[PDB]
Subunit: 343 residues, 4 copies
């Protein structure tokens, strides 16, 4: 017997938000760095960690030139950044919505170790998620993000890790879709270790298959979700070298065997890659001569803002220059969304 | 760790056969009627059941005019019909391969009752399937067929029935793909009972999701398989009337949420429908304004040959007339494969 | 490959605690009533809800006569009651440990609705459970409790509800066993509705089988856990009347088909039963002529303290009389643990 | 909703047969050796393989002295041996039933390779099993046997192998229990390789847990089945030496964590062990100071008849001497069923 989890109006608004995010040529900026990760990033540049420094850095990211308006369709924020205001007086959700963006929020509470496994982790943050999601929906957040970690090792990932992460992702997506918030499912597979394209493709297919089976078990409206996978790439210690066409073929082949075409868009990770090779690989993925029935776009945390963070230096007078670097990367990644990129 | 079930040459030949079957404009004739079903069909026309009568009827089906050559890309046969010869001297696999067809064979051994359930059945025929598939591959069979039965009732289908049928279908597809034979997965959902489009769509999504999860568990090469579903249609005793656009929208929506686009083609059933409404519904399915990244074609047992069986009458001198009726339906269904059909 | 979740010393201390709790003749008092439930219970007696009233009621429960010392081996407390002190100066964990009890704590955060189902709920409270369990282990808590709710209806419980509750219970038990705390798994099946013994036994067997499969998937040390099921009883609106021997036979039969004998003890619920019929049914369960290879004891919330709450009346001078009623029930339930009870 | 797979009379007769087989002091002789295995065994002794030689060897096994009457409660036969007659005129089922035995039959059709795995096999023989089981029930067979093979390796057994073997075993047990035949579930784990007690215990617990979950999914009457596991023993190439008490503790510990006490009996394998060490290990298992709520007995193929096959030599005049050796082993194993054995 069928009891509908969503009314057709809820399905319509979720599909409308999900189509607005991964619109052709647009992508996602991931400004969701928590205090420890952004503390390490501000320590690398050599500045102290203060609320004013983080607010100024996200001012540099969010208040850029108007040329990024058909570049960034969605912005993932922290919980703190939702309640911070710009110096003009507008709060950051209004700054995002003023120039055509969609406000997001990273809603997980970190990783917990799984007992009995070889360093496998699950994700935390399911308690109070309905009240928090209603509160973020009142504050302008229209989509969310949840990050699961899986690593390739000797016998890892086991069935327990993939099963638990798929169940937690489906529970998260159900709770988010009850409150009118488009969930972004992110089964990140770590590129650590030494493993070729074939094993990474195998693990990607198994993890994505268990994820979509768990999404089918929990009555998830697949047209109002987004997928956030990592590109099928060799490990860091792998000695064999692969062309970008082989990486793109492995990624599109691992995606086409699992992902149903009702899913609205696919937003790739950077995943420890360089700033230029991520756009090169995304341009190669969008140039693969297969039939890809979804949006292939970017959700880059480091690969959008690393050059801007370097050219900033913690000094205010460098601002525009740093912003210009960011704008450059955004423009490049927009062409990487369309297959029209060339370096 | 990954141990490949198939070498790249096996993947290439399976993809080549699967692309040859569901080629644009082509479809599947299902002449696989066993002795009991074809005995009831010959009793309805009023002729005795003899080997010569069945051989003559399949002569009428297989030796038709050359206008069905870009209509029928594959023909499913019985075990007996593989070893029967035409009166010209050519055996029926050579008659099929001479005009551009692909020879198939129905390989299951019927249905067995599942204990503890409410009239739910599983499918039989896994023993000796590797030797039988190698023998049929020597005799010209390049694809196979396996039929699972699921009915919608009060609390049926249960989890046990869908789990068992998906596991048996995946085991069948693994055994067939080991021998170079493209498997056709057929999870038929019975249209008996009174149930609307929404419950049939719900059961279709759940059954197809469990089927493709079991196919992912058994390392099936999804590019070298075919899918044989039933159209999402209301029950026989359902009082509500639905347009063909609503049936087509429900079918394409139930397919797009589950089926990954690596699957080469989708061959629909007739499923107790009339001869004209099946082609009308297939033309409506191919005219749906959604993005459908696979081949939508027909595999019609009764809806191709019912008019030919009626116009035959068991008399030899009627032959061409009966054949002409069959040719008409084939031509119509070819346009139903392309969306260019109109009655 | 096997990576041990627990060292042998952790297994030894968990088995020692679990053997100390369900020792022969001993049982569990469930004083874990939260502020809403105990607010309804104090409203039924006609007293206001204050911290002093709840502290005095749990003083009446915990500081009773020394005749309950071979009666109660474990006491489940609230989070608040761990930090409340008696008027003598001893905190309530020290009052429990002074006379031979084991301190427990109810650690879940309530129930959340499951989307798409017919009124089915999952349980909340997984975030921060490792830090909370280490904190409670520092404060004297040696076991925990987690309550999942499942109801029998038209098509409920579905596979989604039992799967999600079993996975959440196994995750809870893993997190508790990492910190040296014996988990008590409670899959409560609601007695609401009209259903006979056979359907309640069927649902109990299916739920307990999925629970123990999920416990096997998560590497749970089964010798250091406890099981908290409900007695297999007909519904509230069921018209058929059953003897206590039939209820006991259905309970022992549903337990013997699922529960492996490595589980240390089984602590039954009251489950909305009367004060005397719970002890009668437990005496019947311990008098069943089958081989029961675990501890059959009680964990009664209402069926231990209802008469004491009634004879208290909110007046201090009634105290001993109220306590005497409680002591009576405790003594009776101790005989209900041993099969030597008679009314 | 519950539809009973078995009436109470069917449950009563299955429980009666299952209690008659594993009666205290009794065990199972496995004379089910097929023509290839018994051909290798007769080639080792140096005699030709003929129907008369196999009939005479099973005459030596089945027509022994009356001292084996409270030793052997059940005998597993081949399909051929059911229809062979003794020289006195009685067919072999009547020879078994005359002195208090129960006639069994090995009903599987061998092992099939699983594609994509590292040398993992599934079991064959599900087709026609209802008609074959009704035929064997007419011919005096009251129980059956089915053998699944699982090996421990680098990453084997995978989830696919254990899932498929558990599903096939549950389907087999359902089909056998529909026809009034007690199924004997045998998940044999191969002792090949080099692995300690801990990994063999881990694999035994995982395999038995998935087996009993699949038995719960298929509505199997657990009181009318038998379990046929292998003893938890180190590998053949394992360098570490273990006492018989450690092997017995590992076996009873792996059994107590999984097997519910509704299962009537546990019949251990020999599993490539010597003739005396199997009885020594079974005596150690029955002397373990844990609570074991089922029958612990033997089902020995080679460890009962190896000395009789050696002392036979293919010569008729040696008969009684060979039979005497067999009787000795049977007597020893009867004491190994009771814990009263000493060498």
């Amino acid at each position: 017997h069928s009891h509908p989890a969503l009314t057709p109006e809820q399905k319509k608004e979720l599909s409308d938000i999900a189509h607005r995010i991964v619109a052709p040529g647009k992508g996602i900026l991931a400004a969701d760095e928590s205090t420890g990760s952004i503390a390490k990033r501000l320590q690398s540049i050599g500045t102290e960690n203060t609320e004013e420094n983080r607010r100024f850095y996200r001012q540099l990211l969010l208040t850029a030139d108007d040329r990024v308006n058909p570049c960034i369709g969605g912005v993932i924020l922290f919980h703190e950044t939702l309640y911070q205001k710009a110096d003009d007086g507008r709060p950051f959700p209004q700054v995002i919505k003023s120039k055509g963006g969609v406000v997001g929020i990273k809603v997980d509470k970190g990783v917990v170790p799984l007992a009995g496994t070889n360093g496998e982790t699950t994700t935390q943050g399911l308690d109070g998620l309905s009240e928090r999601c209603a509160q973020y929906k009142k504050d302008g957040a229209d989509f969310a993000k949840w990050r699961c970690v899986l690593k390739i090792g000797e016998h890892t990932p086991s069935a327990l890790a993939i099963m638990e992460n798929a169940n937690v992702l489906a529970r998260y997506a159900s709770i988010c879709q009850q409150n009118g918030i488009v969930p972004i499912v992110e089964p990140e597979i770590l590129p650590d270790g030494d493993h070729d394209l074939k094993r990474c493709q195998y693990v990607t297919e198994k993890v994505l298959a268990a994820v979509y089976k768990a999404l089918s078990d929990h009555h998830i409206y697949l047209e109002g979700t987004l997928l956030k996978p990592n590109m099928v790439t060799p490990g860091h210690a792998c000695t064999q070298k692969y062309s970008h066409e082989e990486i793109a073929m492995a990624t599109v082949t691992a995606l086409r065997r699992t992902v149903p075409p009702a899913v609205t868009g696919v937003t790739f990770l950077s995943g420890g890659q360089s700033e230029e090779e991520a756009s090169i690989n995304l341009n190669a993925i969008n140039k693969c001569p297969l039939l890809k029935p979804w949006a292939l776009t970017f959700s880059y945390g480091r690969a959008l803002q690393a050059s801007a963070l370097k050219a900033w230096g913690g000094k205010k007078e460098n601002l525009k220059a740093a912003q210009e670097e960011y704008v450059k990367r955004a423009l490049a990644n927009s062409l990487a969304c369309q297959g029209k990129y060339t370096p």
